[PDB]
């Protein structure tokens, strides 16, 4: 059981890249991804989740208009689209799973991607 | 939407002193509350889930705790690795809120 | 067969609303999906596609950053979320399919 | 991204004349042109520049839906569609007021 993350580099603001998550382990159609961000002197910021069998999705205000989500169940792999890069939206990336429906909070975590809006 | 409120900031100790952290919701969350440990260059990772409950392979120094409002969470006898950022998060209603963080420093 | 829309209604400037575009006769896997718009007083624009074998999907300028089109392959049925919602964003909402030869009854979503 | 320009807007015909509606595109579409109608969904009429009283036909540059006889049922609003390329684009819609 593993979450894997690739993406993440210098990005003029105005921008946009996309972040990518990779699962081994699980099936993510049997659960929701999570994305979180880190930003330096603002802990832990939750930006967006997407429930894959269907492909609804909720996102932070700091990012609603700005990221989607969007996943592919074959490959099992979630992205966060990042359209219209700022400033603030420099930190460390992460994808999470939300074990047991929410019952196990985000049991199971990716390394982090750094998104550096240079 | 929820607001997690940390307690301390940020704190020093020594190997093998009992340290306490406190988070307290704005609203009800009915046991809903989750910890997790980052060490610097890490991803977080879960310790406790619901309040009180301990994620399988994590040391049980760890453990969590509630109290209404509030919730605690205490490492009972501080290694090494435990220098790290702790933060807890509601998981009761959507969004998933997060406290501040705590910086422990050892 | 057929596509039949549902959702969409009245809803704030920079509200959310999710539309919805189950399909009959025939199987959304087998084919792309697509939402097409009308706002009061402009032509059609085409706002996004999805091939739901596998979530690939595109979006109009317009709209990127802002919608998500997706698919329940085993409901058989496409969506689209829409957040952040302009009040440019006011039209009938069409669900269609690929040449666009089956075409939804339409739904209005008014932002105002 | 390329255009579709309709010609005309709006126009009013009599329950009886014979109407023309052109299409002009900004990049080569070779015969992929569709006309939906609009009353109500839109309904495809013609895929393809031909195939479905609704005539369509290329004329060089130019694309053409010529209705012969209007009849009262044909009261709508007309696009013209490229299917050539992504992303799909239409034209502005011309209304037929009889």
């Known amino acids: 059981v593993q979450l894997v993350e690739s993406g993440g580099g210098l990005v003029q603001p105005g921008g946009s890249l996309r972040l990518s998550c990779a699962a081994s382990g699980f099936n993510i159609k049997d659960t929701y991804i999570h994305w979180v961000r880190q930003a330096p002197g603002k802990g832990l910021e939750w930006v967006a989740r997407i429930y894959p069998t269907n492909g609804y999705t909720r996102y932070a205000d700091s990012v609603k208009g700005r990221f989607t989500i969007s996943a592919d169940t074959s490959k099992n792999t979630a992205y966060l689209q990042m359209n219209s890069l700022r400033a603030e939206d420099t930190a460390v990336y992460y994808c999470?799973?939300?074990?047991?429906?929410?019952?196990?909070?985000?049991?199971?975590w990716g390394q982090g991607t750094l998104v550096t809006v240079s | 939407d929820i607001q997690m409120t940390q307690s301390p900031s940020s704190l020093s100790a020594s190997v093998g002193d009992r340290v306490t952290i406190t988070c307290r919701a704005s609203?009800?969350?009915?046991?809903?509350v989750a910890w997790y440990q980052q060490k610097p260059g890490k991803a977080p990772k879960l310790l406790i889930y619901s309040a009180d409950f301990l994620y399988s392979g994590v040391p049980s120094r760890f453990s969590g705790s509630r109290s209404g409002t509030d919730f605690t969470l205490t490492i009972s006898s501080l290694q090494p690795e435990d220098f790290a950022t702790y933060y807890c998060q509601q998981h009761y209603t959507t969004p998933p809120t997060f406290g501040q963080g705590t910086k422990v420093e050892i | 067969?057929?596509?039949?829309?549902?959702?969409?209604?009245?809803?704030?400037?920079?509200?959310?609303?999710?539309?919805?575009?189950?399909?009959?006769?025939?199987?959304?896997?087998?084919?792309?999906?697509?939402?097409?718009?009308?706002?009061?007083?402009?032509?059609?624009?085409?706002?996004?596609?999805?091939?739901?074998?596998?979530?690939?999907?595109?979006?109009?300028?317009?709209?990127?950053?802002?919608?998500?089109?997706?698919?329940?392959?085993?409901?058989?049925?496409?969506?689209?979320?829409?957040?952040?919602?302009?009040?440019?964003?006011?039209?009938?909402?069409?669900?269609?399919?690929?040449?666009?030869?089956?075409?939804?009854?339409?739904?209005?979503?008014?932002?105002? | 991204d390329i255009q579709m320009t309709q010609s005309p807007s709006s126009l009013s015909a009599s329950v009886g004349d014979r109407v023309t509606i052109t299409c002009?595109?900004?990049?080569?579409?070779?015969?992929?042109?569709?006309?939906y109608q609009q009353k109500k969904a839109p309904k495809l009429l013609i895929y393809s520049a031909d195939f479905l009283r609704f005539s369509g036909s290329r004329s060089g540059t130019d694309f053409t839906l010529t209705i012969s006889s209007l009849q009262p049922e044909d009261f709508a609003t007309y696009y013209c569609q490229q299917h050539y390329t992504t992303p799909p684009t239409f034209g502005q819609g011309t209304k037929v007021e009889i």
């Open positions: 999470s799973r939300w074990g047991g429906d929410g019952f196990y909070a985000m049991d199971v």
């Open positions: 609203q009800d969350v009915n046991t809903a």
